[PDB]
Amino acid sequence: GIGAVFLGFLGAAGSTMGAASMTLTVQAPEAQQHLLKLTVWGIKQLQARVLAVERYLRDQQLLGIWGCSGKLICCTNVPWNSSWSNRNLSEIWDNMTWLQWDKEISNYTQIIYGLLEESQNQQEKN
Amino acid sequence: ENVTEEFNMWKNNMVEQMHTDIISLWDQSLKPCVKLTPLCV
Amino acid sequence: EVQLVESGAEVKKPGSSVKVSCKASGDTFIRYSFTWVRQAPGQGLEWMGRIITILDVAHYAPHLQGRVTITADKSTSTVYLELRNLRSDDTAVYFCAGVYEGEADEGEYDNNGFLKHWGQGTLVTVSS
Amino acid sequence: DIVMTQSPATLSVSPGERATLSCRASESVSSDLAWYQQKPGQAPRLLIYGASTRATGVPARFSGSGSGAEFTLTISSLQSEDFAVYYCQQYNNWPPRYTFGQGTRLEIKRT
Numbered sequence: 164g165i166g167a168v169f170l171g172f173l174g175a176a177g178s179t180m181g182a183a184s185m186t187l188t189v190q191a192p193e194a195q196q197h198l199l200k201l202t203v204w205g206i207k208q209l210q211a212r213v214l215a216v217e218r219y220l221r222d223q224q225l226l227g228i229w230g231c232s233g234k235l236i237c238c239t240n241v242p243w244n245s246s247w248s249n250r251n252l253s254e255i256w257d258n259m260t261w262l263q264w265d266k267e268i269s270n271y272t273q274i275i276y277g278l279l280e281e282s283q284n285q286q287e288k289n
Numbered sequence: 290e291n292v293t294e295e296f297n298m299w300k301n302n303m304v305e306q307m308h309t310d311i312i313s314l315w316d317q318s319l320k321p322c323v324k325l326t327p328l329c330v
Numbered sequence: 331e332v333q334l335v336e337s338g339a340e341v342k343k344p345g346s347s348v349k350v351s352c353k354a355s356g357d358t359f360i361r362y363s364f365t366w367v368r369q370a371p372g373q374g375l376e377w378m379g380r381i382i383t384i385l386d387v388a389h390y391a392p393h394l395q396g397r398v399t400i401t402a403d404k405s406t407s408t409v410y411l412e413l414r415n416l417r418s419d420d421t422a423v424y425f426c427a428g429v430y431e432g433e434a435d436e437g438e439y440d441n442n443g444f445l446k447h448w449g450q451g452t453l454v455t456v457s458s
Numbered sequence: 459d460i461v462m463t464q465s466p467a468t469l470s471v472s473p474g475e476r477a478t479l480s481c482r483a484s485e486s487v488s489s490d491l492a493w494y495q496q497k498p499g500q501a502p503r504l505l506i507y508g509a510s511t512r513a514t515g516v517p518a519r520f521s522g523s524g525s526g527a528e529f530t531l532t533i534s535s536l537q538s539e540d541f542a543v544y545y546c547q548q549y550n551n552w553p554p555r556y557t558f559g560q561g562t563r564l565e566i567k568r569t
């Protein structure tokens with residue numbers, strides 16, 4: 164279901180971060196004791212799926228704070244600032260991968276989110 | 290597949306979780322007759 | 331198996347506190363468990379307290395709890411006794427008996443509940 | 459706490475006859491019976507502890523056997539100077555609450 168966008172697959176990833184966006188769009192006997200112990204085994208899966216959907220809605224709420232919503236890919240009007248780990252597009256294209264891309268932006272993630280949020284509120288009235 | 294993860298047997302926190310859980314297991318399972326706890330300052 | 335070098339009586343006048351000494355020497359001291367027993371004149375024996383030498387724990391009877399403590403030290407290796415609000419009928423002969431309880435230093439223990447070895451006791455003299 | 463009693467308080471039995479004394483408690487007495495004898499003016503001496511184990515340095519005449527709520531001591535020969543008090547002890551509780559009996563006195567039937 165929609166929880167499969169989080170973690171339900173054997174997704175190898177590893178392939179280039181830039182080229183990974185192509186996959187982004189593609190992405191019993193009636194025993195009383197057995198029943199009373201299967202109840203928890205099932206609630207432990209209902210919890211997982213329900214948490215998946217509310218986490219989805221939380222991300223969409225944050226995206227609505229960021230302007231683009233329901234959008235798998237966004238292009239916000241904030242040019243990249245080199246002050247966070249000055250690198251070059253060739254290295255970002257070649258030597259990076261999605262799982263390997265958070266390790267350098269882990270510290271700048273909060274400030275990136277902050278500016279991204281603050282780059283919108285002035286559009287409403289002027 | 291084709292995924293590399295930086296495991297660390299020494300900074301694992303699951304170990305601390307297990308330690309606390311087992312501590313709580315023994316504290317209830319085994320009853321000592323005369324316990325002695327310093328609790329210094 | 332155990333030799334005692336306990337002090338004398340030094341029993342003070344009624345209305346004061348008493349410090350009954352219990353001293354054993356010549357051999358080890360920590361292995362044994364100690365039991366204090368009271369004996370009123372003409373009555374039966376009455377257990378009064380126990381102390382575990384190597385654990386420094388004490389157990390008293392429910393009614394004398396808060397009225398008596400049994401203190402001990404290992405540097406001198408002796409056990410004292412404290413009695414507060416001393417009352418005349420409390421005048422009785424005391425015993426600080428000991429029992430061997432295995433190699434306590436190496437960690438082994440027995441914690442026997444019987445009493446085998448007894449002290450000399452305590453001598454009293456009543457007069458007006 | 460719990461306290462046991464010994465009955466009869468004293469036995470007027472002349473020397474030369476079998477004597478058997480048992481201290482009975484409301485709880486189990488099959489493995490935690492302690493027997494004492496104190497001469498008048500001295501510290502008590504253990505005779506049989508654990509209801510079957512024999513105290514070190516004590517003549518083989520004394521013994522303790524039995525089962526359940528029935529325990530007996532067998533004497534092959536009686537000794538007049540052995541006439542003294544008989545104390546029963548039970549310490550089957552933790553935290554430790556030891557309560558003695560009251561002692562039984564036996565005397566030769568002097569004329």
Ligand SMILES: *[C@@H]1O[C@H](CO)[C@@H](O)[C@H](O)[C@H]1NC(C)=O
Pocket residue numbers: 175177178179290291
């Ligand atoms: C990753 O490894 C798998 C097999 O382990 C292989 O099929 C795949 O082509 C590899 N992809 C990249 C980008 O290295």
